[PDB]
Design an enzyme around this catalytic site. Structure first.
Site, PDB file in Angstrom:
ATOM      1  N   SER B 243     -28.360 -20.695 -52.571  1.00  0.00           N
ATOM      2  CA  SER B 243     -28.862 -19.416 -52.850  1.00  0.00           C
ATOM      3  C   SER B 243     -27.785 -18.312 -53.169  1.00  0.00           C
ATOM      4  CB  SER B 243     -29.786 -18.932 -51.833  1.00  0.00           C
ATOM      5  OG  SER B 243     -29.257 -18.780 -50.594  1.00  0.00           O
ATOM      6  N   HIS B 273     -32.715 -27.140 -50.178  1.00  0.00           N
ATOM      7  CA  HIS B 273     -32.130 -26.072 -49.626  1.00  0.00           C
ATOM      8  C   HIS B 273     -33.092 -25.434 -48.587  1.00  0.00           C
ATOM      9  CE1 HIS B 273     -29.180 -22.644 -49.176  1.00  0.00           C
ATOM     10  NE2 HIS B 273     -29.498 -22.064 -49.985  1.00  0.00           N
ATOM     11  N   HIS B 316     -25.779 -31.822 -43.633  1.00  0.00           N
ATOM     12  CA  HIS B 316     -25.285 -30.410 -44.189  1.00  0.00           C
ATOM     13  C   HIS B 316     -24.185 -30.678 -45.278  1.00  0.00           C
ATOM     14  CE1 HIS B 316     -23.835 -26.516 -44.892  1.00  0.00           C
ATOM     15  NE2 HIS B 316     -24.924 -26.078 -44.191  1.00  0.00           N
ATOM     16  N   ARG B 325     -26.630 -22.495 -35.622  1.00  0.00           N
ATOM     17  CA  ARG B 325     -27.863 -21.686 -35.758  1.00  0.00           C
ATOM     18  C   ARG B 325     -29.116 -22.568 -35.245  1.00  0.00           C
ATOM     19  NH1 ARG B 325     -27.449 -20.752 -42.214  1.00  0.00           N
ATOM     20  NH2 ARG B 325     -27.416 -22.907 -41.790  1.00  0.00           N
ATOM     21  N   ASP B 371     -32.840 -25.468 -40.502  1.00  0.00           N
ATOM     22  CA  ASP B 371     -33.969 -25.741 -40.698  1.00  0.00           C
ATOM     23  C   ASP B 371     -34.800 -26.346 -39.799  1.00  0.00           C
ATOM     24  OD1 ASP B 371     -33.075 -25.521 -44.328  1.00  0.00           O
ATOM     25  OD2 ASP B 371     -33.906 -23.932 -43.051  1.00  0.00           O
TER      26      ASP B 371
END
Ligand SMILES: CC(=O)SCCNC(=O)CCNC(=O)[C@H](O)C(C)(C)COP(=O)(O)OP(=O)(O)OC[C@H]1O[C@@H](n2cnc3c(N)ncnc32)[C@H](O)[C@@H]1OP(=O)(O)O
Ligand SMILES: CC(=O)SCCNC(=O)CCNC(=O)[C@H](O)C(C)(C)COP(=O)(O)OP(=O)(O)OC[C@H]1O[C@@H](n2cnc3c(N)ncnc32)[C@H](O)[C@@H]1OP(=O)(O)O
Lengths: 429, 429
Positions: B243, B273, B316, B325, B371
């Site tokens: 992105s 993504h 990743h 995260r 995610d």
């Protein structure tokens, strides 16, 4: 037994290439192909060997190649409509396959693209409600994004297909996308410039370009020929250019071909990119406003430079000599519209710009690029809506980026994800 | 004299940075920072030091940093709404400026973004006519592209402003874009999931996240807190991710911030993504369908692997350890929704997946990424429309990429245009 099918050829091609890339990497994956410097990182990867892209290779001095086929080579080698300019269809075959197609191959892409050309209701709708102050590149991009509804790849993915068959759905989606494109583009055209008129139907008996001009509204036979050349030449320009690179980056995440094309268009619309198309005419349009002397023409150019603006259609990140695309364009005009006053101006500038650009001493490439010549040709034919030009670029470009998109998935290219650094970090490094 | 203005701070900041980058390059532009290999080129620039991106830096083992501020550091350092989670506003200030904002700075971003939030007629229109089978990431992207109508940068450019003032219009456009985003996103939400309902008005007295949940329809106070964290954590993740890299590439051509954001969203929507967001829930949703044993859970995972699919939310391109995260997310649930069955499953998988992934021996990073945890949290609050999640990611992400977009133009970063090669060419090399 059997007649023509690009998909069949490809299925034959994929595994060989596959194998071919494996051993090479088996032996040379570790080989250093280059270094990266601080300037490159600050400089937009300028000079950085960064991608494998197979459909075309750009030579800094020679210009673009299709296999290894130059524009002039294509010019003679690709099938023509009857009747002197190469069919973008043939080009497409060429790109996909590495081979020079026969007329009979070529006729198939035509038929195929004629069959595929269908617009969905939600899309026509959106196009019809769009504001006229919404840029046509904007209009195009939203329409293609919105077409993703239809993605055969996005569906297949949802379903859980094995990664090996990716290329297969990507191909279907690419072919449908190419097919529809002229419908979307002409619909935009008609909406904005020919209000109350309709695009009409696609005639399976025409080549894709001829269908396009019909839907666009042009009858002039030479214009169709222009269109054929134009769409062929704008096809592809290796992988590192903003548009193609964008599709490549976005496609690597497994976003469907519709979405990847759309993002690409967003990049084609930057002034440093495809929009130069448009910026050139408007600059020539200002120019004339304010048959001039070389000296005044020179004053004019300095004034842009001093103003912290760019001279549109001159310069290149990679070329270092006059774009052959430009040359190609010039030779078309010299045949067809040699007395056009606009043509004459563009000829004139070629004499001046590069020189002024050498004077300033900033552009690494003082020569003209494709964008410098393309509008002049369109205007002559009556297509004088300049804010439209980049759409036309948009349409051609699909041919190259999509052709490549299919190989990427076919070769199993992974997520494009480089490493970034901050200044602090680099400074500390 | 005077009160708060980010633009004033920036004007002060720009020239110093400017100077700072010049000398560094004056001394080190030629310094080799790395090499490139055949594998990197075939491998999505994996490992390739390729961009300068200032707002954030990702550490392979440590995870993301905001200055040099870790998530935990932000957690304590950024101003909260009253009342434990950091305001994305503060984060934004942080990103733009390098500094930790005061509450009073922060209140200003809020007010500012409250003032800017206006949707134009053509846009509302399009959103209202969209098909319900059109993906919300599709919907979002077309809407933002369509917003380009409004671009202050695109206008200024048209007009011929000097390149030096680019950053200035980019900033206006960034702030307007951030402002509008939640309106666009909630409008999509409402259209698709709450037919006949309306988004309502923006209350200048709220923080941006609270305004968002209001327009979204959520009353739960803890949900607002979740939203605040979520939007902060998803902010930015250095420049090499699809992105952010896309926005950077597209913005380098001088395509306005609207168009650059839009392309970015097209990349956020790929399964590799941001869409992982969504893919995780649906995978957990299948999972449950077909309170299970670790052993069955293991069978389940093998079956995806054997099927040539990916396990979503694990792995990743750059991280090599569990995403902080993820950890962040987990700690929120452990506080707020520790007994959630879905939560429990996700906890369970953490025990299993990585192990199965180590077993298979293909993923370089067997640990979970952002995610893997984000949907679980949303579901619990009642937001169970999974095909929506990535929109939320889309909204946060604007904060980082836009923050950077402004520096790029400010620093005068050039066209992103690397060199590509074909296999033949490379083989010959
Ligand atoms: C379809 C296509 O995109 S083909 C090109 C279309 N775009 C254009 O025609 C825009 C005009 N040209 C340009 O802006 C550039 O030549 C580009 C973007 C094509 C190449 O950019 P770069 O590879 O970074 O160019 P280059 O290395 O020559 O840059 C050196 C300097 O010369 C400037 N320069 C290059 N081209 C031009 C131009 N046409 N007019 C004025 N100055 C120019 C660059 O802007 C830069 O100025 P800076 O030092 O203040 O940043
Ligand atoms: C918001 C974000 O994007 S964070 C990540 C979101 N995406 C996901 O969760 C998708 C699932 N994960 C993946 O596909 C990957 O781990 C990525 C794309 C994130 C990283 O890709 P890469 O850097 O190329 O991964 P890696 O170097 O580990 O690849 C080695 C091999 O392991 C595979 N592998 C990596 N992750 C996974 C996974 N989650 N499931 C199964 N196999 C995997 C790769 O697909 C590759 O298989 P291949 O040799 O046939 O091509």
């Amino acid at each position: 037994a059997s007649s023509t099918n690009l998909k069949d050829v490809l299925a034959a091609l994929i595994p060989k290439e596959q194998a071919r890339i494996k051993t090479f990497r088996q032996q040379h994956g570790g080989t250093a192909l280059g270094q990266i410097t601080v300037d490159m990182s600050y400089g937009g990867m300028r000079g950085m060997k960064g991608l494998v892209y197979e459909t075309s290779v750009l030579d800094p001095d020679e210009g673009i190649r299709f296999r290894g086929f130059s524009i002039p080579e294509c010019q003679k080698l690709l099938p023509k409509g009857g009747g002197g300019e190469p069919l973008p269809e043939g080009l497409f075959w060429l790109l996909v396959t590495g081979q020079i197609p026969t007329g009979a191959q070529v006729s198939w892409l035509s038929k195929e693209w004629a069959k595929r050309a269908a617009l969905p209701s939600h899309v026509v709708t959106m196009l019809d409600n769009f504001p006229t102050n919404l840029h046509p590149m904007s209009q195009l991009s939203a329409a293609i994004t919105a077409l993703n509804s239809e993605s055969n790849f996005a569906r297949a993915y949802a379903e859980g297909i094995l990664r090996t068959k990716y290329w297969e759905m990507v191909y279907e989606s690419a072919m449908d996308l190419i097919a529809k494109l002229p419908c979307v583009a002409a619909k935009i055209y008609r909406n904005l410039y020919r209000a109350g008129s309709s695009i009409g139907a696609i005639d399976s008996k025409l080549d894709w370009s001829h269908n396009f001009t019909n839907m666009l509204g042009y009858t002039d036979a030479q214009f169709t020929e222009l269109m054929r050349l134009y769409l062929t030449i704008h096809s592809d320009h290796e992988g590192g250019n903003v548009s193609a690179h964008t599709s490549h980056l976005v496609g690597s995440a497994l976003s469907d071909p519709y979405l990847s094309f759309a993002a690409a268009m967003n990049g084609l619309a930057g002034p440093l990119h495809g929009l130069a198309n448009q910026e050139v005419l408007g600059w020539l349009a200002q120019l004339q406003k304010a048959a001039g002397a070389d000296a005044s023409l020179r004053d004019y150019i300095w004034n842009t430079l001093n103003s912290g603006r760019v001279v549109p259609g001159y310069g290149h990140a990679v070329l270092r000599k006059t774009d052959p695309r430009y040359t190609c364009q010039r030779e078309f005009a010299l045949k067809h519209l040699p007395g056009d006053p606009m043509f004459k101006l563009v000829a004139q500038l070629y004499k001046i710009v590069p020189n002024v650009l050498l004077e300033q001493g900033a552009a690494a490439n003082p020569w003209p690029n494709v964008d410098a010549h393309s509008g002049v040709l369109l205007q002559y034919y009556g297509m004088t809506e300049m804010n439209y030009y980049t759409v036309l670029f948009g349409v051609s470009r699909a041919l190259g980026v999509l052709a490549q998109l299919i190989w990427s998935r076919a070769l199993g290219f992974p997520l494009e994800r480089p490493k970034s650094m901050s200044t602090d970090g680099l400074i500390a490094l």
